[PDB]
């Protein structure tokens, strides 16, 4: 019934893994800093009208455990009636928080909701939380557990993407990311991280290597050779995909997503809640879907096709996943991840979905375009997708 709008979409810069500037910052403080930024931009907002805070988080242990969304509500001095729930849907958690907040708005039983994600992978690495399908041998044996990296090399093998092909895309993602930063595209959405004295900690995306060449990319050695022969994950993969003979390992650290820290926040509310609080909507949530065949599920649900979409935003977990997605729907090259992606800027698990959503809200406004499609954790499996309209 109701229509879900986006009123704000902010995010911290992404601090790298080794010698990272955000390594000393607790993930709880990453979120609170973004909350205090929303206050700075709307000091008239009645925080009593915020009915939930939904944060994506893939490794909710240690610094990120104990319902980190509730801790953000308490530590930032929000009303005790603002709730706070953490969720986990692997790489899609950040976008699942946004879509859930949109659905909670449409159901009429929620008015204004904060959604987003946080992930400090240099303080809490992935896998730190455990898991059955990894640490319970009966289930692991039956489901044929294979890490997502080996699957990406498999995709490059079947589809026929060479090492030269994945590295060519890795270069474009670095070039577009440098052009977007130098052009001021990120000036209003990237909120620099400061300490308790106002001193600056980080203001740019550290993982970027804007001077990348294709000769340096070719010098890197494949990144998942030691993992595929540590536990024999090549052999387990080829037992199910039995028609392929040998996996071609073409993914390195220069064409896979970076391991970084960061957070993002999105203010989602109804039209009526926006007028009362003096908020202007920036985008509208057209449709959300869960399932390439999750992108189609959200196209049919919104009565749209590929030609009607102005911009496509696919998370760059691995180059071959983006290339395969580009040839499956014939996505033009100038519509796909226009302002760089996770290969250049990093992939902070629980926050990535909410980060790249805000990146499209701003590029729609900057380009004066209509629609954009965002999707993560893609390639069948457990993917999510969302279409936004600029308003």
């Amino acid at each position: 019934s109701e229509e879900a709008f986006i009123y704000e979409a902010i995010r911290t810069p992404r601090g790298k893994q080794k010698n990272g500037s955000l390594h000393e910052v607790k993930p709880l403080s990453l979120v609170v800093g973004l909350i205090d930024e929303l206050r700075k931009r709307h000091p008239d907002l009645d925080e009593n009208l915020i009915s939930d805070v939904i944060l994506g988080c893939v490794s909710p242990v240690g610094d990120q455990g104990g319902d980190i969304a509730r801790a953000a509500v308490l530590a930032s001095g929000m009303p005790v009636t603002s709730g706070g729930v953490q969720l986990n849907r692997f790489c899609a958690s950040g976008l699942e928080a946004v879509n859930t907040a949109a659905q909670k708005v449409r159901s009429g039983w929620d008015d204004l909701v904060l959604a987003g994600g946080v992930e400090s992978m240099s303080r809490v690495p992935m896998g730190s939380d455990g898991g059955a399908m990894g640490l319970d041998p009966a289930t692991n044996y039956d489901v044929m557990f294979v890490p997502q990296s080996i699957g990406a090399d498999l995709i490059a093998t079947i589809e026929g993407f060479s090492r030269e092909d994945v590295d060519a895309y890795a270069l474009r993602s670095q070039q577009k990311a440098a052009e977007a930063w130098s052009g001021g595209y990120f000036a209003k959405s990237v909120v620099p991280v400061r300490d308790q004295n106002g001193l600056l900690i980080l203001d740019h995306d550290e993982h970027m290597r804007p001077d990348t060449t294709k000769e340096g990319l070719a010098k890197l050695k494949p990144a998942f050779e030691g993992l595929a022969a540590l536990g024999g994950f090549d052999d387990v993969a080829l037992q199910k995909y039995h028609w392929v003979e040998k996996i071609n390992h073409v993914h390195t650290g220069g064409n896979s997503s970076g391991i970084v820290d960061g957070a993002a926040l999105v203010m989602i509310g109804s039209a009526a809640a926006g007028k009362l609080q003096g908020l202007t909507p920036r985008a509208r949530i057209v449709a959300t879907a869960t399932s390439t065949p999750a992108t189609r599920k959200v196209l049919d649900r919104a009565g749209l096709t590929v030609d009607d979409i102005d911009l496509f935003e696919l998370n760059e977990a691995f180059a071959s996943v983006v290339l395969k997605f580009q040839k499956d729907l014939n996505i033009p090259d100038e519509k796909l991840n226009v302002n760089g992606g996770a290969i250049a800027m990093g992939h902070p698990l629980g926050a990535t979905g909410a980060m790249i959503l805000g990146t499209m809200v701003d590029e729609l406004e900057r380009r004066n375009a209509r629609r954009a499609l965002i999707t993560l954790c893609i390639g069948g499996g457990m993917g999510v997708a969302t279409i936004i309209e600029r308003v």
């Binding site: 390594h23 000393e24 607790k26 240690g62 303080r123 300490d195 308790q196 004295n197 001193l199």
Partner: protein, 729 residues
């Protein structure tokens, strides 16, 4: 990245001497030419930067380092004159300064060579932090030497690596509780037992030879780990476990609530910052942990509480223990035998602190039975000190042997210092002194422990009015550190100086006050307790009143303090103040607390001495608030904010201190600040009751102007006794 604070186009003083020996051991002797103590100043950071740059450049010919000092102490303190001028916009400069300091100690500690700290005298604050960067610490077991990190007692934290290194050495809990939270100072023998120091030697001459001996043996016996700290090896395990270990993570959420309970809710930000840096630092590597420690350090230095505690517990105490209120041209007059009149809790405590200091004490009362029970106060204090192991039987027996109980006035033969502690009555002190003034030495100081009665009227009962003087102690005398020296109109300048010397001899702190009814302490403590009783009459819940006192920072809640002050004494004090005004023809405006006082006297609940006050007492111990208290005063019918109850108490004492300075009662704000903290218990985070105005910080602003604005808020809502004096406008 540099060991020097500046790297662009005067010059400080060199404070470190470089000596390299034949074997290749470099000796770093610290000796600041501009002072008798080595301090953490700009001259040291530049000097230590040059020496560290030189250790790295000559690393191929250097085999070990010894850090020594040329003063009587090792290294103690910092440049407080510079730290107290740190404003919020200086946080960048503070952060960079401590990062440079710690980078100097980080290079020295990972030099690849053994470094030994030859701790000759006292290493406090930055001193111990320098010694903690070394790999081995030898201390000279000498009289007066102390090792510790007392930055918290000035509203700071060990910012030069003290928090990170002690946590890496002793674990989170043992570092915070034993070393960091209270800034405990240790003796060289106690430091060896808790791991702060490794070896002890007998004299300072053996230190550098013992260090060089340890270096030579260390390079032979264990070469792979020479110059490597335990936390810089592959198999390091933090004692007590990391925060993410199961044993420590079960009690870890209870550390802040235990700290919230020791402070009783008081707004003192330094221990909070220490606990945060300790725990947050134990979650990351050393160099990241060290940087977190800098950020928490910078926020404390640029804050207001630190300036208040530095102003009070450094500058104000410097001026007092330098003789600020002592007369100038007076000499030393040694004291032979002390006479104490009265075996009550005051006189017995006075006799104890005098005997503990080495003085011969004669304790007189109206009967030998009472006098003998007065000396029993010292027996019970020495019994506890024996069981706890703080004193020997030899030391304890000599202390008790200097107390002589008597009932005879003639036992005051050769007494040259009288301290009367009898019932506070004008004509009793006349009779008691009349029977003593002729037996004592003709040069005897005749002191009186009076709380309110003016000394000028008391001195008319003796013939030598020049040596009658007020000497106000505080119960219990063995723990309370202040003595209020009260000068009558006829009290000479020599008597002040001789009592001033006696205060420092017994290890207490003296303030000098001019004569006036109520003096300073008793008059200001009355405004504090009268505010609380006013709230009780207004209908505020008694539990809220007591919480308001504790969360403000007072050592004892006001209703608990009132029972101990005795409501009978409080009432006739108000009768004396009422008479002093009605005799001058004026009309008396009573405090609304006087109605509450008379009601508790009316109901037979005059305090603790009578077994019933605002609290109940059973088996000689306090046992909960009196249940009938809420019905007597209709408690709950008035529920003001807690911050308003807290401010009414703080402001009542601050304003009354100001009126004491305007009337010449006190002669300096140093006496007002220290006398309010050590005397009546005004919260230490304020820097005193006078610093509370110049340093005031509230939601509306900062400083004298904000204090005046808040006092006018309180006046519009609670009564014109909060209107600031004209001297603040």
């Amino acid at each position: 990245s540099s060991h020097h604070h500046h790297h662009h186009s005067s010059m400080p003083d060199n404070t470190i001497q470089w000596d390299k020996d034949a074997d290749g051991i470099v000796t770093l002797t610290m000796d600041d030419p501009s002072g008798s103590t080595n301090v953490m100043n700009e001259a040291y950071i530049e000097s230590m930067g040059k020496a560290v740059d030189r250790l790295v450049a000559e690393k191929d010919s250097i085999t070990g380092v010894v850090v020594a000092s040329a003063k009587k102490t090792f290294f103690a303190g910092g440049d407080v004159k510079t730290m107290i001028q740190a404003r919020p916009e200086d946080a960048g400069d503070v952060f960079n300064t401590v990062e440079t300091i710690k980078r100097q100690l980080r290079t020295l500690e990972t030099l690849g060579k053994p470094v030994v700290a030859a701790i000759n005298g006292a290493a406090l604050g930055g001193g111990l932090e320098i010694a903690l960067a070394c790999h081995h610490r030898i201390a000279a077991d000498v009289k007066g030497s102390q090792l510790g990190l007392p930055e918290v007692t000035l509203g700071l934290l060990p910012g030069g690596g003290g928090v990170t290194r002690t946590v890496r050495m002793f674990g989170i809990q043992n570092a915070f509780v034993s070393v960091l939270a209270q800034g405990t100072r240790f003796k060289p023998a106690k430091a060896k037992e808790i791991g702060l120091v490794d070896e002890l030697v007998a004299t300072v001459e053996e230190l550098v030879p013992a260090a060089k001996a340890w270096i030579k043996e260390e390079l032979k016996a264990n070469p792979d780990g020479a110059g490597v700290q335990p936390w810089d090896k592959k198999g390091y395990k933090m004692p007590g476990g990391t925060p993410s270990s199961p044993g420590l993570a079960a009690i870890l959420p209870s550390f802040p609530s235990n700290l919230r309970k020791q402070l009783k809710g008081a707004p003192m930000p330094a221990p909070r910052a220490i606990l945060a840096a300790a725990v947050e630092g134990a979650q990351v590597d050393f160099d990241t942990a060290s940087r977190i420690e800098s950020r928490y350090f910078a926020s404390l230095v640029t804050g207001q509480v630190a300036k208040n505690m530095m102003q009070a517990f450094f500058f104000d105490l410097q001026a007092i223990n330098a003789g600020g209120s002592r007369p100038e041209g007076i000499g030393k007059t040694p004291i032979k035998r002390i006479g104490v009149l009265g075996a009550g809790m005051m006189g017995a405590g006075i006799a104890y602190v005098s005997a503990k200091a080495g003085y011969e004490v004669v304790l007189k009362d109206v009967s030998l039975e009472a006098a003998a029970k007065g000396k029993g106060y010292s027996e019970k204090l020495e019994a506890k000190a024996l069981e706890r192991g703080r004193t020997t039987q030899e030391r304890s027996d000599a202390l008790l042997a200097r107390i002589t109980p008597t009932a005879d006035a003639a036992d005051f033969k050769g007494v040259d210092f009288v301290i009367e502690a009898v019932f506070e009555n004008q004509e009793l002190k006349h009779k008691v002194f009349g029977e003593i003034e002729d037996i004592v030495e003709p040069n005897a100081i005749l002191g009186s422990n009076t709380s309110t009665l003016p000394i000028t009227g008391l001195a008319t009962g003796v013939k030598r009015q020049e040596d009658f003087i007020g000497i106000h102690f505080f119960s219990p005398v063995d723990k309370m550190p202040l003595v209020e020296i009260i000068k009558g109109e006829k009290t000479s300048d020599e008597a002040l100086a001789r009592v001033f010397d006696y205060t420092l001899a017994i290890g207490k702190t003296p303030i000098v006050v001019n004569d006036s009814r109520g003096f300073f302490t008793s008059r200001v403590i009355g405004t504090f307790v009268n505010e609380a009783l006013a709230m009780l009459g207004e209908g505020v819940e008694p539990a809220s009143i007591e919480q308001a006192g504790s969360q403000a920072g007072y050592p004892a809640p006001p209703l608990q303090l009132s029972d101990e002050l005795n409501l009978e004494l409080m009432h006739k004090i108000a009768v004396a103040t009422r008479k002093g005004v009605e005799d001058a023809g004026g009309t008396y405006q009573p405090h609304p607390a006087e109605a509450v006082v008379e009601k508790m006297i009316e109901l037979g609940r005059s305090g603790r001495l009578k077994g019933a006050g605002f609290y109940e007492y059973a088996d000689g111990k306090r046992s909960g608030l009196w249940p009938g208290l809420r019905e007597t005063f209709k408690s709950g019918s008035s529920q003001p904010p807690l911050q308003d109850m807290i401010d009414r108490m703080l402001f009542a004492e601050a304003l009354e201190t100001q009126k004491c300075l305007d009337e010449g009662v006190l002669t300096s704000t140093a006496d007002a600040n220290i006398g309010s903290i050590m005397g009546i218990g005004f919260p230490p985070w304020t820097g005193g009751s006078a610093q509370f105005i110049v340093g005031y910080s509230g939601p509306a602003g900062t400083g004298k102007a904000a204090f005046v604005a808040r006092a006018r808020e309180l006046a519009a809502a609670y009564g014109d006794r909060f209107l600031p004096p004209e001297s603040l406008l």
